[PDB]
Amino acid sequence: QVQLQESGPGLVKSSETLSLTCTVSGGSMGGYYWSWLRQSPVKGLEWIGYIFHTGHTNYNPSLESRVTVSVDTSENQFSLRLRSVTAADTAVYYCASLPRGQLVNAFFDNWGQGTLVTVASASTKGPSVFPLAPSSKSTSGGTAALGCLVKDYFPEPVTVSWNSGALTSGVHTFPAVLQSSGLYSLSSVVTVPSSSLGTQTYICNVNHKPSNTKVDKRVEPKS
Amino acid sequence: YELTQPPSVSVSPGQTASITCSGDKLGDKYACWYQQKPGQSPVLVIYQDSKRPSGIPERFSGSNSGNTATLTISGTQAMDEADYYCQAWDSFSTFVFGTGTKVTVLGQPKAAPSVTLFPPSSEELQANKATLVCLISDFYPGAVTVAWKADSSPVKAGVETTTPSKQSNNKYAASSYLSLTPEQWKSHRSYSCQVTHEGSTVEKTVAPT
Question: Which of B121, B169, B176 should we substitute to test contact with A (largest number of A Cβ atoms within 10 Å)?
Fold first, then answer.
C-alpha cells in the first residue's frame, strides 16, 4: 500500500547542488530501504544510493563524495543531495523502495513517477500560451479541432490537460521542438464534435513546474 | 561491472521472446527484471531469478545459470512491447543494471497520417510574431517528410520539425512549426503544409481571414 513521489522537476545551474525530496504515503518509513536512482542515455539506468530509517546510508562508489542522502521520519520523506553537478548529470531521477532484511535478495519494487532534472548554464523561462482556435460553423455534423500552443519555454517538461482532466478522449499532446534558440515549444490538440462549440467550454491547462507557472487558457471559436 | 543484454529483439504476436543478461559470475547471485514503457517508470516483473509478483501474467518467466540470466516471454502480445532491464549486484560496486533490450512485436499495418494546420493566433500576431503549426498524427512507420509553401513556392527558413515519436497507439506523431513575421503572413495569399508518408502526400493550406 506504499506510494512514492519525488519533488517537482527543475533546472540546476552548472556546479550548483541538486536537491530532491521523495515523499512516502501509505505506510511508515520502516519496513523498507529508501533508494535514489537515475536514468538517461549515456548513463543508462544506474543506482545512486539508499538510506535506512536509522540513518544508515549506502552510496554508489562512482557517485559518492558528491552524494548526500538524508531521511526525515517525522514527515515521511527522504532527500537526495547531488553536490557539484554538470551537464552529464542531466537525467530522470527516480525514488524507489527496497524490501527490508537481507540485501542479497533485495530489489526495486515501488517506483515514483520520476522527475526530469536538467543541468545547464542557462536560466529558467516561463512559457507563452496561445489559443489554436477552431472554425466557427460548417460540419453538419462532426469533428472540429481546437488546441493550444505552448511557446518558448525552458527547461522540460510541460504537462498539458484539458478541462482539468475532465476531457481526455480526443486529446493529443505532441512532443516539443528544441528550437534554434535552445528553447522548447509544444502543441496540444483536441478533436471535439463541432456542435459542442458554443455550448461546451474548452480550457487547456498548461503546467510548467520548472518555472512554477500554471496557465489556463480558454479556447473559443473565431469570427 | 557490465551486465550485457542484446540491444534489440523482435517477435511476431504469439512467438516466444528470449532476452538474456550476461556477466560474471553471475549464478551465485539473484537476478531480477524490469519492464519499462515510454514515458513510464520501470515495473518489476521477475525477482530472485524466477519468482514473479502478483499481477504479472504467467507468460513471463525467468531463469539463471552460470554466466547467464534469461527472461522468457511465451505467447508475446502487442502490449509487451517495451524496454527490459536485468538487475543484479556486485557489492564491490553494489546494484547494477543491464544495458536494456527493446522488444518489438511486428505486424502493425501501414497507417496514413492525419494532418491538421493551424494559422497564427490573433493574440500572437498582436505580439508581433507568427507561428504556423502543422500537426501530424497516427502514422506508421515513423518516417515522414514535411515541406512548406509560400503561395506556391517552397519555404526554406523558419522551419522546425520534431523527430517522429511513437504514441501509445504504437503509431507515430510529429509536428512542424513555421516561424514568420506578421506582415509576411499577411503578404502572401496562402501558406501550405505538405506531409509525405511513403508514396502518399497530404497538403493543408491556410490564409489570412
Answer: B121
